[PDB]
From Swiss-Prot, chain A:
Changing T190M: In strain: Isolate CL22; acyclovir resistant. Changing A143V: In strain: Isolate clinical LA/1 and Isolate clinical LA/2; acyclovir resistant. This is Thymidine kinase. It comes from the Viruses. Catalyzes the transfer of the gamma-phospho group of ATP to thymidine to generate dTMP in the salvage pathway of pyrimidine synthesis. The dTMP serves as a substrate for DNA polymerase during viral DNA replication. Allows the virus to be reactivated and to grow in non-proliferative cells lacking a high concentration of phosphorylated nucleic acid precursors. Changing T20N: In strain: Isolate CL18; acyclovir resistant. Changing C272Y: In strain: Isolate CL24; acyclovir resistant. Changing M40I: In strain: Isolate clinical VA/1. It catalyses: thymidine + ATP = dTMP + ADP + H(+). Changing D222E: In strain: Isolate clinical CH/1, Isolate clinical LA/1, Isolate clinical LA/2, Isolate clinical MA/1, Isolate clinical PR/1 and Isolate clinical PR/2. Changing P124R: In strain: Isolate CL20; acyclovir resistant.
Swiss-Prot record, chain B:
Changing T218M: In strain: Isolate CL23; acyclovir resistant. Catalyzes the transfer of the gamma-phospho group of ATP to thymidine to generate dTMP in the salvage pathway of pyrimidine synthesis. The dTMP serves as a substrate for DNA polymerase during viral DNA replication. Allows the virus to be reactivated and to grow in non-proliferative cells lacking a high concentration of phosphorylated nucleic acid precursors. Substrate binds at Y51, Q75, R168. Belongs to the herpesviridae thymidine kinase family. This is Thymidine kinase.
Amino acid sequence: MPTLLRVYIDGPHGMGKTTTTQLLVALGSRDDIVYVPEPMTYWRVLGASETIANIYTTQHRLDQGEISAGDAAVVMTSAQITMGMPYAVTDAVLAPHIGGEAGSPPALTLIFDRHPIAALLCYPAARYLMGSMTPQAVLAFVALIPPTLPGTNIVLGALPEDRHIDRLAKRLDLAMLAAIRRVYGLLANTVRYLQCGGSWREDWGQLSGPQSNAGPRPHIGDTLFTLFRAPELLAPNGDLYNVFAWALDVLAKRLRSMHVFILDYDQSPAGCRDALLQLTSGMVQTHVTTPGSIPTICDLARTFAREMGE
Amino acid sequence: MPTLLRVYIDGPHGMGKTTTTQLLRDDIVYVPEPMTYWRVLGASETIANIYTTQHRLDQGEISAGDAAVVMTSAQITMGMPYAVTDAVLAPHIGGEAGSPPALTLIFDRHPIAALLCYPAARYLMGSMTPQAVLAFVALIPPTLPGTNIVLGALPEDRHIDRLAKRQRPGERLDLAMLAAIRRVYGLLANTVRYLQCGGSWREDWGQLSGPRPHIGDTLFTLFRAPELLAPNGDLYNVFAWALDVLAKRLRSMHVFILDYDQSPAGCRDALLQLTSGMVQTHVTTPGSIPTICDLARTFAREMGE
Ligand SMILES: Cc1c(CC(CO)CO)[nH]c(=O)[nH]c1=O
Ligand SMILES: Cc1c(CC(CO)CO)[nH]c(=O)[nH]c1=O
C-alpha cells in the first residue's frame, strides 16, 4: 500500500501559519501534496453567521460588564461547536482510510490548517482563562475529541510575544493572545510529559499555586492539567469528581500518541517554509487502508478547500 | 478472555425506562441517569434551563437564535457523562463474541440521545439550528461492536399519561416536545433498518424532493433543511459528510424494541427476554471487567444521586 503523511499546522493565530503552509504546498508537485485550509466560509456563512466576530464581540461585552459570565459561556460554548465542526467531520471521514504507522517518499501529503484539538481543547481552555467559558464545558469538549489517529503529526509554533503582538496587530485582545499562547505552551509540555511516562493521577498532589519532543519530563504544573483544579470540579473532600477525572484521562490518551514539533516562526516567510520542510523529515507516516484511499483523500481535501477555504 | 454485554436503554423519556432497569449482584451493573451532573456538577439545573428557554421562545420573550445558543450549550452538559463514559470504556471493548456473559452492563441511555436525538427534536421545535445538530453528529463516538440499543414503544396517550406523573426537576409538560422526541426515535429506528438493508442516502436523496423504509421515513429527511443547501439546492459537502458519519455510526447498532404498555414486572421480564439476541463482546484485558465495574458503580454513586 502507498503511504500517507498528515501534518497539522496549529498554534495561536497570527504567527504566519497560513502563509508558511501555502509556501510549502507551492514547492511540491501539483498533486503529491494537498492543503486542507482554514474553513473560514463555514465559520462566516455555512455553519452560522460570522462566528469569529460573535466570539470577539461576546468577550468584549463580558469585559465591559454588559453581560454575565453565564451569558458569555453559553455563546462561546455554542460558537466552539460551530468552530470545530469542519475539523471533526473531516477527521471522521478520513479515519477509515488511515492504517498503521510506517516510519519517519509519501504517495500523498496532507497539510491541515489546524487540528480538531484547536477547537475542542485550546480555544475553549483559553476562553476558560478569559472567564468566558466554564471548566466543565472545556472538559465536555475534551471528552468529545476524536480518537487520535496514527501518524498525527502536529506542528506548534514559537514566536516571541513582542514579535507576536506586532505581527498580530493587523479589536486586538492582548489578554486573549496571552491566554492562547499559554494554552499552546501548556499543550506541548503536556505531550512531552505524557511521552516521558508522566501520570497525572500520580502527580496530581504536586498542584498548587516549551518543548514537545525534546528535554526532560516537565512538572505537572507546566502541563494542561493544572487548569483543571478549579473549585467547580473539586468535590467537598478537595479531590476531583470522577467525571472530570475521567475527562483528564481522555485528554492523556488523546495527546500521548501525538507527534508534536516546534516551528520557529521568528524568521521570514521563506525561512519558515524551509524550516517546516526540514521538520517534515522526522514526521511519522502511515499506510492507507485501501488502494483507492489516496484518490479519495485528495477529493476530500480539494472539496473541503473549495467549499470552505474562501 | 471474558465476555461483556452492553445494553443501552434509550428512547423518549417518560415511558418507564427508569422503573424497568431499577427492578433488578455481581454479574450485572446498572449505570443510571446522571441527574446530579445535570443539576449540580456540570451546571446549575440543566433540565430547567432547557425547558425554560423553549417556553420563553414559545412566548416570544427571546429569539430563535437566542434559544439555539442556550439549547446547544445545554446539550454539551447533558451528554458529557455519556461521552466521557464511552471514551474511557472504548479501549476495553474487543470483538464480538457471537450469536453466559461474565458481566452485563445496563446503561441509562447512549451518547446518541444527547448528540443526535434530543438535538434533532430541538431542531424540530425551532430551538436549535440544523448545523448545530450535524456538528453534534460529527462528534458521535465510533460504534463499537456489541452496541445493543433498546428503544421503547408506547401509544401516545399512554405516554403523555405516564410522562405527566413522572416529571423531572425543572421539566415542563410540553406536548409539542413529546411529539418531536417521539418522531425522532421512530425515525431513528427506521434509519437503522434502512441502513442495514442497504440504503444509501446519497442514492435516495432525490426522493425527498419528488425492502426498507422510504428515505422520507428516516432521519435523513430532517437534513433537507434550507440552511444546509446551497443556492442551487445541493447539500453543502460539509453536511453531506456529516450524514455519511450518521450512516456509519447508526448502521452497526443493534436496535431492540421494548413494549412499555404493560406493568413494570412485564417491562422487566421483557427487557431480560430481549437479551438472548443482544450481541456480546470480548474485553481486551483480563482486568477489564473489574475496571468496568468500578467505572459503573462509581458513576452511579456519584452521578445517579
Ligand atoms: C480555531 C479557533 C480559532 C482560530 C481562528 C482565530 O480566532 C483562526 O486561526 N479561534 C477561535 O476563537 N476559536 C477556535 O476554535
Ligand atoms: C438526554 C436528554 C434529555 C432527557 C432528560 C429529560 O428531558 C432525562 O431523561 N433531555 C434533553 O433536553 N437533552 C438530552 O440530551
